[PDB]
Paper text:
The complete image processing workflow applied to this dataset was also applied to the two single-substrate datasets. From the ATP/IMP/NAD+ data we resolved many different structural classes, three best-resolved of which were: the filament assembly interface, and two different reconstructions of octameric filament segments. We determined the structure of the ATP/IMP/NAD+ consensus filament assembly interface at 3.0 Å resolution. This D4 symmetric region is composed of two symmetrically opposed catalytic domain tetramers. The interface between tetramers is formed by the 12 amino-terminal residues of eight protomers, which each extend from the core of the molecule to bind one catalytic domain on the opposite tetramer, in a shallow surface groove formed by a short helix (476-485), two beta strands (51-63), and two short loops (355-360, 379-380). A key tyrosine/arginine interaction (Y12/R356’) anchors the attachment; mutation of either of these residues to alanine was previously shown to abolish assembly, both in vivo and in vitro. Residues 1–7 make mostly hydrophobic interactions with the catalytic domain, and an embedded arginine (R480’) is positioned to hydrogen bond to the I6 backbone carbonyl. These interactions are reciprocal - a protomer extends its N-terminus to a partner and receives the N-terminus of the same partner, creating four pairs of symmetrical interactions at the interface. The overall surface area buried by a single interaction is 2,300 Å2, with a total buried area of 9,200 Å2 for the multimeric interface. There is strong density in the both the IMP and NAD+ binding sites. We have modeled these ligands as IMP and NAD+, however because the enzyme filaments were actively turning over when flash frozen, we have likely captured a mixture of substrate-, intermediate-, and product-bound states.
Numbering used by the authors:
A (entry chain B), B (entry chain G), C (entry chain H), D (entry chain A): 1 to 110, 234 to 420, 437 to 514
Write the structure that this text describes.
């Protein structure tokens, strides 16, 4: 009878909110803490949200947290902790090739464990783009790296396209990560070159000053939406880096179309981070450089050198991140991240822009003094 | 792997077209032959499209074609033909009450057959709104009418609300058809009164001049969309009358949210139409009056008296109408009318506005002479 | 110095007009005689405009005029005249398979000549979609047809995708024409199936009533723009049929992104058209049926049967069409049709919408009596 | 074949971003750090970007960095350093005429060297507008100044037009710099007066308070776009001053249509700056006054007096600025500044607006403490 015969299954569900296409075609450069996600319907508990998310076309992870190839964030002790909790790591290329191959060998021998066909835990390693970096890839492949990141500030070079053509005939089983891209044109110029997964976002890092120096980049959330919108046409996941201070930005990045979220500062200064601790004004903190900083080794500095206070160990930290992600996906109303992105591209999951006074009341306000403890 | 993990099930499906909400909020008064439906995907043959569509909250028909309570369109010989091919009829109230009760008795004794629980074919009968028309309803209920139409040019009266309150306590099993409404406010003021199904559209009849005389009404397709949009919130089907010359307007009316389509001129001058034929200039044609014409029996004329050439019998005519509806629902890409409306309200089924030169090339053009034969 | 150092090469060139993307995102359903092309700069004569335009991914023609597979427009005597003047023909499938294979054999044995590698003039032949039409393709391939048209009113069926998968492994050198499509979604669902060239436009034929009957289709010029916009992403030409009464609509269709223009009524009633002439009211005219008319051989009629007055022979007619196309491309300001489409997609070639009174003064007006002779 | 015959040369290149005309017609007053430039395609190294940019209609420089005629920024020791690294200087007019003529004589006798026909390095000198300043120009022409700046807060006076008419008949080979203009109307009222190059921007200086005092001016980037848009119609370069703290604003100013960038505070407190150093709270800093400050020599103050910490010498500083400009032009994707402006006015180079939270994450964030070293 009529209660099914008019529409069928779908109830009314009023039209409060903006969809993602309506939000990112107003022209404004929205970042993470500039919009938010409207809630939906809950019919499931929090702990039964599966965070299965693809890294490349062939590589699938159990949780979408991947780390960033920076010489103060990832080495072997980092990648074992990221892969052991279900993510993946990327050993930086700011060292000698035998050192990077040694560390990839170290992590590859060694619950949600993210292991390959031969039951060893996964590992990635970023390479450069210059001609001498073809020798690094042949040392990383002998140690058996599973995925490589063509680490560059600008991903639309003829050099990176030539490197992708160099990899996709000498190693047909190896997965490559093209980047960095922010616009859909340079997404096109890499997906036709054979990239298995893009890496979106330039300028919005916690240490990047390349928007302040080179006048280039774009706001982060618009990049994550408008590259993933193009990249799902060809079945290519994207990776969002930079701009993450908290678990809310991870949920926003996953909701806008990113598959995994790459984090630099939020995993910096852990126990598994390279380097060691030192004290400044009584606060235990570990230093955190950028790749384009002039502490890399007439040159321009696309980054700064700084320090971050510690946050303990990762095995007590990324459980908080994954628990925050499933609570956010509960309040959104989807049982998986795939269902989050399906509800977003289907127009069901609706967003809303957030003004400046709305931002300053979204946080902590109207208190004399507070202490913010997250877990 | 990634081909499911980004979106899942839903492919890309580019964003060509306007949805119905984007189409009917431009402000323009679009009618039937002023927009059209963009096609979709076919994975089914034409003849397996089921046209099951609700008439009221309790009454379900097998095909959405219902007839109009006009004294030159429906009597017993009409209603047996409409119910016998799966629709329903409405015996007009432009006669004495014993005549209408006699004809409803005649049709109720007497494939897709539209029969009740006691296996007799369904029948409706329109009543007035004045106080003496309470005696007509008590004669039609003794003959056992299944649904009644509160036939009025303006459906938001206190008189019609009082008649609905009079019916919904003396006959709790009887179904009522409130109308005519064109705006969502008078949809609200009847659905809270207890109407089982609305009847949308004033002024857009083939013989109505009440837009030209009383300056009231609205364009038909916008009425059918904006009342059905309100009426599906409460599980109330709507009926669209007027403006139909062809099977294309039936498909457009069903796609915009109407459940059944009421037709006056397209079933006028059939063999089962009341009256008899006469010849004028060698063309066999049967006359067709309007209810608000001054040939009803200081008064204003809300209708004209005219004539329509014949179209044979209904049992060879409504097979053409239902075959046109399933071909249109094939080209749209939905297996049922319920799926058509679900794709429309879900934003999947997309429309496009059509300009004046687009209308004049949509029909027949650039020929010396042609003959248009439909079946 | 500064006259080159500010911009370089590009002069000012003020911003009068609308680009094609700005024109076909206002939402309106623009057809051919509803907009027009703003002129540009001339630095070349008319006769040195080359009309080289691709039919499929592999087939290239010398002039973009192709004919339509209709049983009153194309047979062998038509296809020899179309191929002999540089176009191509498509022998209709409204006959027995041995008759169509015989006529394709007849045209394949037999200046701008459009010939293959073996120096015989090209020929196409439309096939159906049903299972028994697999036997027609194997008879047309023995006679050596160069391209086939999957002739259908709706090109997004599972049946046509299955036919394309059936052709693209049994005949890897054969070219297929998918259609008919009007929206970019069904362009996607065929280009991934392996179509070499799309055929855009439904409803806008000179004899189609399928917008008036099945409530489906879209205005023609918006279809030609929005499918070619999607189809040039994958290097797939499109073919525009219907809506052409004159050489102006051919120039508008080629400017919006179509590569070749398929014409039904404008080549009907020629000397090379099938059938024979007859007189009605003293005018020599030849009949012209539609495929969906009920004169094909419970069924709906998607077309009408009519007649067109004669226009002589093609060898005196298509020189007028190609001369009109190069005069239009002169006034636009591009030396080739490829340069027309490059100027259109680059935003250089600008358009302007045209209102109803602008249409009625664009034609002939303010005269007592006139005679319109075109060549 | 078809891969060239549809469009030709131009690939798809999706439509992500806003062009400059779409950006500066939203009405908002965008400045430098309020939008940014989307990247493009790289097929060239950084060091082969030529920064050849015109100063006037006749004067061409090798790098677009010019200095500002302020009595604490430019004297002879400044202009030799600016011209020696390829730019040009402007000796201020806040002194006696014999002193300015002496210093212009000093700089004119005395790699990318910016030299005239007689192989001496170029020099400019600003003059006033009052009647006694006609005597300054006749002393500067005897020492042989190559270009003069009519230094004024408002460039649309009858006084400055009379001075331009006074110069362009007594010195037909001398180049004049009209300014300051911010709107296209006062660009028109000077270009018809005979200006060889405009000087755009009022109020947006690092020491100007004339927006806070005289309620006049406009945001800087909109001025640089909307005067250069008018000025390239007549082949007139523009010079952008004020609002520059970094090399990113230089790249944004050059991308919006400026030919050279005039900088006041970014070259203040160098070794070649006039005056001498002093210490305040342990930081070596040199004072930096404004021309409209009441330290010029009932009057209103259009400027403030302040101080800037040192940045070393220019011969180690402007190599950083030019290296930042060619890295920015690499990431944009153009081999020259002329190609940057050609891609901008052609609609190829696309921009994007940047919100407030996008600005606060574009810089350094989420760190405990950092040190920002640029080279
Ligand atoms: N958030 C971001 O995306 C971002 C932004 C800025 C910097 N960074 C980091 O800063 C690091 C350095 O940035 P980068 O791109 O300048 O490093 P890079 O060494 O890859 O680039 C150096 C320059 O050389 C050019 N190049 C590439 N291949 C070349 C070749 N064969 N020959 C000559 N030149 C070649 C590049 O165009 C570039 O201008 C990167 O590792 C990146 O991770 C990241
Ligand atoms: N397409 C349309 O919707 C449309 C438009 C115009 C006319 N019509 C047809 O024309 C016919 C006549 O139209 P109508 O509405 O004027 O018929 P009606 O007899 O119902 O209305 C007559 C007038 O009396 C008023 N009325 C209702 N109840 C009353 C009561 N107890 N006491 C006093 N006045 C009362 C009504 O407001 C109306 O002004 C209708 O049967 C209708 O079918 C239809
Ligand atoms: N301008 C246009 O695009 C246009 C519009 C209308 C009609 N036409 C012409 O009208 C002709 C007839 O139109 P048509 O599409 O109905 O012809 P058709 O025979 O191809 O279609 C007949 C119906 O059968 C279905 N079909 C396809 N394959 C099938 C299969 N194996 N089994 C069962 N059903 C199958 C189709 O969906 C369709 O509903 C066409 O040749 C076309 O050229 C063209
Ligand atoms: N970013 C900027 O554009 C900006 C803004 C404010 C101030 N400034 C600086 O401040 C300095 C002083 O500004 P200013 O324009 O007031 O200096 P000014 O001496 O040129 O102007 C003084 C006033 O006299 C008027 N004037 C010009 N010629 C005159 C004449 N023959 N007779 C009488 N009056 C005449 C002017 O209109 C002005 O009101 C300028 O050197 C300028 O560089 C720059
Ligand atoms: O030196 C730099 N300048 C600008 N961006 C950088 C630099 N080094 C790394 N990045 C990017 O910053 C990301 C991490 O930033 P974060 O997550 O904000 O801390 C990395 O994944 C890189 O993409
Ligand atoms: O007299 C009248 N004036 C205006 N509308 C009328 C009149 N009589 C009937 N109608 C309406 O016209 C509809 C049928 O019109 P048609 O389908 O266009 O022929 C009926 O269902 C009534 O709603
Ligand atoms: O029967 C029909 N109904 C609707 N469209 C048709 C029919 N037959 C052919 N067509 C289309 O009409 C086109 C030619 O129409 P014309 O060029 O306007 O004369 C053909 O190429 C077909 O795509
Ligand atoms: O006194 C003043 N008030 C406002 N603007 C000034 C003044 N003096 C100089 N300017 C402008 O400020 C520009 C330099 O400012 P800056 O580059 O922001 O440091 C100069 O080129 C002048 O156009």
């Amino acid at each position: 009878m009529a209660d099914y015969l008019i529409s069928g299954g779908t109830s009314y569900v009023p039209d409060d909110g903006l969809t993602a296409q309506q939000l990112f075609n107003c022209g404004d450069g929205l970042t993470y803490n500039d919009f938010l996600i409207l809630p939906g319907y809950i019919d499931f508990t929090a702990d039964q949200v599966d965070l299965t998310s693809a890294l490349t076309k062939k590589i699938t992870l159990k949780t979408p947290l991947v780390s960033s190839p920076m010489d103060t964030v990832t080495e072997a002790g980092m990648a074992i902790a990221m892969a052991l909790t279900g993510g993946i790591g990327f050993i930086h290329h700011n060292c000698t090739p035998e050192f990077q191959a040694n560390e990839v060998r170290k992590v590859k021998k060694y619950p949600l464990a993210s292991k390959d066909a031969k039951k060893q835990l996964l590992c990635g390693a970023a390479i450069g783009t210059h001609e001498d970096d073809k020798y690094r890839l042949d040392l990383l492949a002998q140690a058996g790296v599973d995925v490589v990141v063509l680490d560059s500030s600008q991903g639309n070079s003829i050099f990176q396209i030539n490197m992708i053509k160099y990899i996709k005939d000498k190693y047909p089983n190896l997965q490559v990560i093209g980047g960095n891209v922010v616009t859909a044109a340079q997404a096109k110029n890499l997906i036709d070159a054979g990239v298995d997964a893009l890496r979106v976002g330039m300028g919005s890092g916690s240490i990047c000053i390349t928007q302040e120096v080179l006048a280039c980049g774009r706001p982060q959330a618009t990049a994550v939406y408008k590259v993933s919108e193009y990249a799902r046409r060809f079945g290519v996941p994207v990776i969002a880096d930079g701009g993450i201070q908290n678990v809310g930005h991870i949920a926003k990045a996953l909701a806008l179309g990113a598959s995994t979220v790459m984090m630099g500062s939020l995993l910096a200064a852990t126990t598994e981070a390279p380097g060691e601790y030192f004290f400044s004004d009584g606060i235990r903190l570990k230093k955190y450089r950028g790749m384009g900083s002039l502490d890399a080794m007439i040159k321009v500095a696309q980054g700064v050198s700084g320090a971050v206070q510690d946050k303990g160990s990762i095995h007590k930290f990324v459980p908080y991140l994954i628990a925050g992600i499933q609570h956010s996906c509960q309040d959104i109303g989807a049982k998986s991240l795939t269902q989050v992105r399906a509800m977003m591209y289907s127009g069901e999951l609706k967003f809303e822009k957030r003004t400046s006074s709305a931002q300053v009341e979204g946080g902590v306000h109207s208190l004399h003094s507070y202490e913010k403890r997250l877990f």
